[PDB]
Design a protein around this ligand. Sequence first.
Ligand SMILES: COc1ccc(CC(=O)Nc2cccnc2)cc1
Length: 186
Amino acid sequence: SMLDDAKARLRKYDIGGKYSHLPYNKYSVLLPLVAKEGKLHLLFTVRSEKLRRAPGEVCFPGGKRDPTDMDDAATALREAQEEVGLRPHQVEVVCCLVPCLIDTDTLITPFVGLIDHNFQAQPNPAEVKDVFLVPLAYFLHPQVHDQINHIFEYTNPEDGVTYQIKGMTANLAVLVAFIILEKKPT
Ligand SMILES: COc1ccc(CC(=O)Nc2cccnc2)cc1
């Protein structure tokens, strides 16, 4: 099946907890995969304009590890719950992708999670201005704008709203699309 095939692909790239004990300032992100209309999508947030770091930018759910977290995956799930109401029973964490090093002292660990078909986002307005889906296949043929660095523009055909996706967020989306969608029969 589509979902079993995605999970099998994702598992081959799982680094596990290899890098997780290293003494960094630690953040986790959840790359939430949603199946709608026979296709996989990624769920993104738009960060509230109130937030000090990167207000109004497109981001994956996630945030800073805290002492309650049993592990890095727990960080991602806690933060996703806080931001979009995703409950742990509504997500299956399939793997841990390559961590992202930033600012010399920070390590961001991404987890890919399969999201339950009955999940409905409940954006928490103190953290998140918007939640939206992008079909995973979009990231194979994105609409690219150069601002000099590359920015994706995605227009939701449901409402015509255009979102700009960039940076680590755009990078991770492409990675996940390659992993899951490369070399598939039609
Ligand atoms: C320092 O670099 C990063 C650290 C954390 C994150 C993830 C994140 O904070 N996501 C979020 C938070 C609030 C609302 N929506 C999404 C991304 C980059």
